[PDB]
UniProtKB/Swiss-Prot annotation:
It comes from Homo sapiens (Human). Changing residue 55 to R: In CFC2; characterized by a defective GTPase-activating protein sensitivity and a strongly reduced interaction with effectors. Changing residue 13 to D: In GASC, JMML and OES; also found in a breast carcinoma cell line; somatic mutation. Interacts with PHLPP. Interacts (active GTP-bound form preferentially) with RGS14. Interacts (when farnesylated) with PDE6D; this promotes dissociation from the cell membrane. Interacts with SOS1. Interacts (when farnesylated) with GPR31. Interacts with RAP1GDS1. Interacts (active GTP-bound form) with both SHOC2 and PP1c (all isoforms) to form a tertiary complex; SHOC2 and PP1c preferably bind M-Ras/MRAS, but they also bind K-Ras/KRAS, N-Ras/NRAS and H-Ras/HRAS. Interacts (GTP-bound form) with MAPKAP1/SIN1; inhibiting K-Ras/KRAS activity. CDD domains: H_N_K_Ras_like. Acetylation at Lys-97 prevents interaction with guanine nucleotide exchange factors (GEFs). The modification N6-acetyllysine is found at residue 97. Its main location: membrane. This is GTPase KRas. It is a lipid-anchor. Ras proteins bind GDP/GTP and possess intrinsic GTPase activity. Plays an important role in the regulation of cell proliferation. Plays a role in promoting oncogenic events by inducing transcriptional silencing of tumor suppressor genes (TSGs) in colorectal cancer (CRC) cells in a ZNF304-dependent manner. It is an enzyme of class 3 (hydrolase). Changing residue 22 to E: In CFC2; exhibits an increase in intrinsic and guanine nucleotide exchange factor catalyzed nucleotide exchange in combination with an impaired GTPase-activating protein-stimulated GTP hydrolysis but functional in interaction with effectors. Changing residue 12 to S: In GASC and JMML; also found in lung carcinoma; somatic mutation.
Amino acid sequence: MTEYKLVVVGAGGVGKSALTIQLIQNHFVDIEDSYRKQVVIDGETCLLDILDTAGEYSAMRDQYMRTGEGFLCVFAINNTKSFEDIHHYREQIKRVKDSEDVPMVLVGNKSDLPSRTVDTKQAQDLARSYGIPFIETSAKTRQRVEDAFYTLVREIRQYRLK
Ligand SMILES: N[C@H]1CC[C@@H](N2CCCCCN3/C(=N/S(=O)(=O)c4cnc(N[C@H]5CCNC5)c(c4)C2=O)Sc2c(Cl)ccc(O)c23)CC1
Ligand SMILES: Nc1nc2c(ncn2[C@@H]2O[C@H](COP(=O)(O)OP(=O)(O)NP(=O)(O)O)[C@@H](O)[C@H]2O)c(=O)[nH]1
Ligand SMILES: [Co+2]
Ligand SMILES: [Co+2]
Ligand SMILES: [Mg+2]
């Protein structure tokens, strides 16, 4: 059965654990580990192996970046530093993978909040510059959570045909 190693990265408190638990448990959470879930995407069954990371020992961070097949780069829409810090997570992943081309999806989490400091258009334009998809999600309401993870799997599949 095809297996995909997914990694959720981003600054402290953006919602990495809440997004992962929402995909696994369908529940909004009120320790960093890995989670497994068999899913069907586009008529193909696969096993998702998801690592929830911290906002860590450098050698371990490099290992998860080396092992990871696809990365969800998460920022929160009310946290400008978390959005600016996407540059750093992207740079670190591309450096470890020694590739300009790594399956990645930019995620703007907390879309339910009325305290938005990052415009959708700003994050859209950044994602276009990076050549990656951009999705806004709410781990609280489950809005677009499956879309974020399933879009990441589709990017990994498109990459594997290259
Ligand atoms: N279950 C205990 C012992 C393992 C701990 N752990 C995290 C789970 C490792 C899962 C195996 N794994 C990996 N193993 S690892 O590369 O040796 C590794 C990397 N980071 C780890 N922990 C860091 C991530 C969470 N914050 C510290 C652990 C193991 C690491 O030391 S990489 C990886 C990826 Cl990219 C996707 C899915 C994965 O399941 C995966 C969690 C607590
Ligand atoms: N309103 C709202 N709050 C959210 C959302 N996702 C996460 N939160 C809240 O944000 C806080 C941090 O969430 P958490 O999932 O721990 O984030 P994290 O990125 O995993 N934290 P860390 O890097 O420490 O591990 C919690 O209070 C959580 O309830 C969301 O979509 N909307
Ligand atoms: Co509960
Ligand atoms: Co830099
Ligand atoms: Mg967490």
